[PDB]
């Protein structure tokens, strides 16, 4: 929750921005309270906890 709040305040990335969050890369679909959803270039959806991202 704290990591998600920080990611919402400081914006290292936004919905629609290609990123590489520690070994996983893909367009960011949405940032939520507990985790954010990205869609890899292959076409699969990946959900990452915000704490791990931060």
Picked from another protein, ligand D12, none, the partner binding residue 16 (CB below 5 to 8 A depending on kind) is none
Neighbouring C-beta atoms of residue 26, cutoff 10 Å: 19
Q: What residues numbered 1-54 form the site for another protein, per CB under 8 A?
A: 24, 39, 41-49, 52
The phi, psi pair for 51, rounded to 5°, reads -60, -45
CB of 36 to another protein, least distance (A): 11
* Rounded Cα gap, residues 51 and 22, in angstroms: 12
List of residues contacting ligand D12 (CB under 6 A): 1-2, 5-6, 9
List of residues contacting another protein (CB under 8 A): 24, 39, 41-49, 52
């Amino acid at each position: 929750l704290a990591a998600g709040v920080l990611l919402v305040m400081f914006r290292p990335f936004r919905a629609g921005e290609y990123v590489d969050l520690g070994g996983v890369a893909g367009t960011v679909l949405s940032v939520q309270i507990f985790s954010t959803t990205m869609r890899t270039a292959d076409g699969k959806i990946i959900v990452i906890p915000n704490g791990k991202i931060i």
